[PDB]
Symmetry: T
Subunit: 61 residues, 12 copies
């Protein structure tokens, strides 16, 4: 069984980093993270901060 969590990473360098950012939180706090699928991307402006929302996937048990 996999499970997914919907996290948004933010970096002031790139979207790819913005992804890494969240994947790193999922990993700080869950074991067996298997993949992640990008569901959205945006830029905070209002430094400019890029965001990448990921469904992080992770094997149950």
């Amino acid at each position: 069984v996999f499970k997914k969590v919907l996290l948004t990473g933010t970096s002031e360098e790139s979207f790819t980093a913005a992804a890494d950012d969240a994947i790193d939180r999922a990993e700080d706090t869950l074991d067996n993270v298997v993949w992640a699928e990008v569901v959205d991307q945006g830029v905070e402006i209002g430094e400019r901060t890029y965001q990448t929302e990921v469904q992080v996937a992770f094997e149950l048990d």
Copy 2:
């Protein structure tokens, strides 16, 4: 990092309330709720109860 939870609120008054309803649960039980995005809305009939499913967003740490 943000995180999201997929909750469905229900009110017998309106969709807006049906949203409030869930946002209030997310808040009962999580700190730093930042926003929420409506992903669906329906009406239970089978009183008539309106539903609004929200992705509730909330800042990690």
Copy 3:
């Protein structure tokens, strides 16, 4: 078996009412209406009239 009909309700008060409006037609004319799912919403302007298109669901037999 359920069946669905694609109806658009209109109210000059709100979207929630605009939904009620149609759900009330489905009920005038069908027995066992079980639920309804919002598929769209708009505003006539050209009073301002709000619309909510619903797939109204109803149990066959």
Copy 4:
């Protein structure tokens, strides 16, 4: 020919109001506004402020 503008209204009462809000800006500043179609809805929390993003439509010439 119609044209559309992508505006987000916000009210601290409801989504329907959040729609009205923007439709009122489109009207402050354009003639012949014909309709509007809801493309999204959210709630600012981080008072609670409801949003409704509309494609506002308006007849050219």
Copy 5:
């Protein structure tokens, strides 16, 4: 209030089983599971293992 979790079941018999598989995990670990909605389906090949990703829904409190 309902809540949902995004789980992927896998069976080497069918998609329907692949669904059951996850619904059984949601139930091992949560009370009041009300329904589930299929959001995706795939086949691992690289025995052939069918997958069905479900949003499992479950009543809060």
Copy 6:
């Protein structure tokens, strides 16, 4: 001309059956059913009953 009806079949065995179920109602009550397209699938839990919503297509005249 084809026409379509939006029906949901339910079986306690599988999604495929859940489809058959509705296609059988469309056929009980319409002549020339040509095809059907799956638009959704879910599981009632709250026995476990699988659902498959179909747009059933059928030739007019």
Copy 7:
């Protein structure tokens, strides 16, 4: 209240005709047809026959 029916027109000349084709059936058999929205288009080959599936809309009462 509007209602919609999901019809597919076919012409061996064009998609636009393929639309007209169905809108003409909706009109043969319903009063107050208000508009129609194209939901799909295809070509039968297996003369070449173009199809346009429409949600035909029509005012109730």
Copy 8:
């Protein structure tokens, strides 16, 4: 940089014309129109007038 405008053309001959119609307005009033992408199509009935909504694209500066 490109920019886009969301225009709806209408012709009483065809969808293709309904597209041309708007692309001609974009051109009346903007320089460097590069392409356009069809986002929707409908028929006014309530002569029969075909519509094609386009995102018209045009190079900035």
Copy 9:
């Protein structure tokens, strides 16, 4: 088994022709072409050339 290829036809007359255009290439080079489904349509401007992208379907063996 069917298979599909993702081709874009272009004509300076219409979208329907733009479809024919590609369906004719699929046929130049494959046997048993069964149908085709329109996935997109656009206009080159930057004569005006209409495009229709098709998934062309064709029976394997």
Copy 10:
């Protein structure tokens, strides 16, 4: 690099089989098939034959 092919399998038993059916063609004729993702499902009626369209994925080189 992966590559994908868009195939439709058909079985007169189930959707899962209808998937297997195509995955078996992809394998008859390509090496390293890694996975497959269901993009659609339908039933031929006009025996009843279930279909499952798959994007079959397969590692290049």
Copy 11:
């Protein structure tokens, strides 16, 4: 009220830059740019130039 404009940035380095590119045009010419949401990304080839289409958002008044 927010408003949005649909711009496509292009860079020969990355998608993130391709985003920055447009966000910089929106800013050259509008005050209060609040955020931006990625709606598409592509690569011109026919140097290789990456594109990122953004809905740039900006507070009215």
Copy 12:
């Protein structure tokens, strides 16, 4: 006529590279590659490898 192929590139540096990766395979093996459109992006974890699935487009003849 254009044609498209559905390829997934992977890089351990970024999504943009993950795109380049596949566009480079399409070019190794086809003449006249005109553009490419991003349809998905993910990260293998289970080094971290970023993926970008592209529809690579290429002019026939």
